[PDB]
Design a binder for this molecule. Sequence first.
Ligand code: EQK
Ligand code: EQK
Ligand code: EQK
Lengths: 606, 71, 213, 75
Amino acid sequence: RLKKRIFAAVSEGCVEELVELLVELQELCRRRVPDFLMHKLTASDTGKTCLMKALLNINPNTKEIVRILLAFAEENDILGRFINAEYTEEAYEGQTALNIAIERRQGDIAALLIAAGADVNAHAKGAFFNPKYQHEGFYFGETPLALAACTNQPEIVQLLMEHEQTDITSRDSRGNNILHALVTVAEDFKTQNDFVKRMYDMILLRSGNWELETTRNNDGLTPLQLAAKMGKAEILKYILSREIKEKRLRSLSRKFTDWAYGPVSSSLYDLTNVDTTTDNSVLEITVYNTNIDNRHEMLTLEPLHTLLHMKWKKFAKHMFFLSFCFYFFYNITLTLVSYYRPRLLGRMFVLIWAMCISVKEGIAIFLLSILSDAWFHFVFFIQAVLVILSVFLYLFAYKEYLACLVLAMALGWANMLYYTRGFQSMSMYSVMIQKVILHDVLKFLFVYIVFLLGFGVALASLIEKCPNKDCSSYGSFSDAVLELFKLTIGLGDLNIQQNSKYPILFLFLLITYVILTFVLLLNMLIALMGETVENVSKESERIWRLQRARTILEFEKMLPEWLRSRFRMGELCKVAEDDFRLCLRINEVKWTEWKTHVSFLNEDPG
Amino acid sequence: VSKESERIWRLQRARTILEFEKMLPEWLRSRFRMGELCKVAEDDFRLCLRINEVKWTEWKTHVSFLNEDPG
Amino acid sequence: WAYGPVSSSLYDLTNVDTTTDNSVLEITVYNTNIDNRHEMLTLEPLHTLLHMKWKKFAKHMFFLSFCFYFFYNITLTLVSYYRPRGWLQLLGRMFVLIWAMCISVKEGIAIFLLRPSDLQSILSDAWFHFVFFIQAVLVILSVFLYLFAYKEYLACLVLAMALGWANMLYYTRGFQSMSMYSVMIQKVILHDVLKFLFVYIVFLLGFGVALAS
Amino acid sequence: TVAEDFKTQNDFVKRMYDMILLRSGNWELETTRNNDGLTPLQLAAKMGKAEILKYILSREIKEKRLRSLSRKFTD
Ligand SMILES: COc1ncnc(OC)c1C(=O)Nc1nc(C(F)(F)F)c(-c2ccnc(C(C)(C)C#N)c2)s1
Ligand SMILES: COc1ncnc(OC)c1C(=O)Nc1nc(C(F)(F)F)c(-c2ccnc(C(C)(C)C#N)c2)s1
Ligand SMILES: COc1ncnc(OC)c1C(=O)Nc1nc(C(F)(F)F)c(-c2ccnc(C(C)(C)C#N)c2)s1
């Protein structure tokens, strides 16, 4: 047939004479109308046309070939639905020839196709271009502008934005516009040369306006909140501290120096969607999202760090010390009620406070990874439940209340860790609350149960029924399991006299058990110690900073509306003709970048 | 031993896979027999295995094909 | 195929995919005179061939191997605990006996064609053929000594149960997480615990003679 | 008073100190006491400007005329 011949002549490109003669033959067959021409000019299995197959296979003679193809399509008044054709397969649906021309870094042919009238809003709405998860498919933004900006082709991005029909505010299937897409594709500093920062700045300045940055995708996130959700520390550092000095695009900045005199410089940072006064700010998302493992570097950014420090030093230090004091006196009263138990009028101060915790942490659990952040919610709730249960059992005629009361006292003294985590002495607890939490200890427990059960059977089997202390504490299976457990708990004793027909085999298996349990214990030991003390101190400091931020936000959530408005970090500042956006002032001193100061809001510093 | 674990796991895994594949009956092996025929040249027709690799650290351009239409 | 960071390539499997006399896969896997297999079993065609063989049949064959050994070990434990000190007990004992004979012939065949330089490293899979064979031999020997009028069948039975539960480490080295855990455990034991135990037995015997005299 | 460190200033205050001290070649600048009685050297001692103090305490002018401004004389 002629379809395969045209496709081969257009993919191989060894000479355009083959495709010229084949197109002459095709026109001859057509003279004997548009649907037939393109049904024979496309591949019915995918919807691909000769133009896509020509651009998918770039060869030293492909520009002339696409020129020939477009000339033949325009000479038949079909170029409209031929240059705008798109795939039909489920995986690559929506992909057109301009996507392929840009993905092949062919700028000249791309300009050719845009001049010929290829619509520049073609959304590659396929399951390959909108992957369920990354690393299975290629998500760039489902648009020729997003594809030109994601593949680092600023020439084509200029060619696309200078066009007339381009939609810079176009939103793809995922709800993302160009800026969300740039945020998702951006990875790092020197991994791919950090061109996405350049493209972000260029696309935001070219369309100088706040609509691209205030647009929410289908998850209700803006490009800034989307950089906060993921761990895009570089794009977040750029957007947050973004200083444009062009006189017309100054209102696009998020940081405004107003003060510089010499090395001293007082800058303002913008706190609109950043300072926890809205639905979910960069602060909220950066602090509470436990899916990046990069909060160590994102909570030290320019406005966020000082915002956390200010909230702390303003009210969270006081609220935290007050709650620590209240829990400390709660625990002291609990200890004195547990010591002077009736084997004395304040025995109720505990109860009330218990119920308070019982509801507070209770509600705190009802509103929701969740064993590293919310652990203390569960332990405080369990402690309060134990206390109220001890009281209920004490006023009833139960003598089992002492167990719960002593357990509650002990668990409260253990919960005292939540308040002392950055104290360099409760460091190992505050760090093994995370590594030992889930997987490090359950493997040990499984292997230890296997050891215990197997060796219990092996040792109980070796023992002979005897006339009723039996001369053997390894009698039934339960007695051997108990002896072995007591052994790994240093509560036991090795006797070479256990009333066995094979005492040497019994001794061998007992010592084998001892040594194997010691190996398991040593594994868990070197696991939870894992010293590298520089790095473990990094880990403890990082955990303290993260929990400090988390509790700062928890404490800010507790205050009423009026107290929150009275704390309310951020001075109102005019930054443009009429902008008046709440900012946060940061004074700095730099003795290295000596420059004449031409960007400032106030000419008289102070 | 952090990595030595992966080394020993990979070696034991490969040896287990190969001995299991040897244990099967010849018709079962013929049934599984990963790899599909593919015409490479005028008459080449070799058993090729298609591997799709996504490397997200890519900075280059590709222009070649055997069936340009993505599968 | 390549479009962006994606690339669908077509590798050749002519003398590679284990359908010839000795392919690159079988040679790369079975040759233990190099100590470079860790780097060669990661090349794209061999890597994906092993992955697909796994997914297709070897995952299931391995899980069935593990399940059969697990239930054989459980029945061995049950006949060791409930020993005589014949309705269904002897059914289970005949299960463990025929399965011990099967395991013994299998691992003995594997040992016969087990070339040296496989046993070069202690943390190597080749070593397991020996412990599986020893345990199956202990089981059949205990059944032989129990059919006769011997008392020492219990030592062999308990040793066989203990060695089977130890041999489950071969299967825990086949799963992925349990691979790292079990290899760490077995490294600790076979390398450091044995050296320390040699020098510590020296200490024990010396100071025991010293304090006893 | 203005000198900070090397990681923050790259040591230009030492160079400006040398320049302004040589161009006005006389002990009137180094023997002057502020409203605390501190000379520039005692002031560099009081606030721990270790780089400025190291410069002043061992300052050797090899020029023949400005050698009386030296504090260390390699002979
Ligand atoms: C700063 O710590 C303290 N300071 C002064 N006094 C204290 O107790 C009187 C304490 C203290 O930690 N007490 C505790 N109580 C309990 C409870 F089980 F009862 F909940 C503790 C507990 C809970 C869960 N797993 C364990 C382990 C794994 C270690 C075991 N086994 C221990 S720990
Ligand atoms: C998952 O492990 C288990 N789960 C449940 N039950 C079990 O045993 C009842 C087991 C188990 O490990 N059993 C074992 N059997 C034996 C054998 F000596 F017989 F070979 C073991 C052995 C072999 C060589 N060197 C030692 C050391 C160095 C430690 C000494 N001394 C111990 S260990
Ligand atoms: C034959 O003994 C074993 N075989 C195999 N494995 C074993 O442990 C894994 C063991 C064993 O002795 N275990 C132990 N457990 C505990 C406990 F912490 F629970 F109390 C032990 C204990 C008891 C009392 N005073 C301490 C001091 C203060 C010295 C400390 N530290 C530790 S000792």
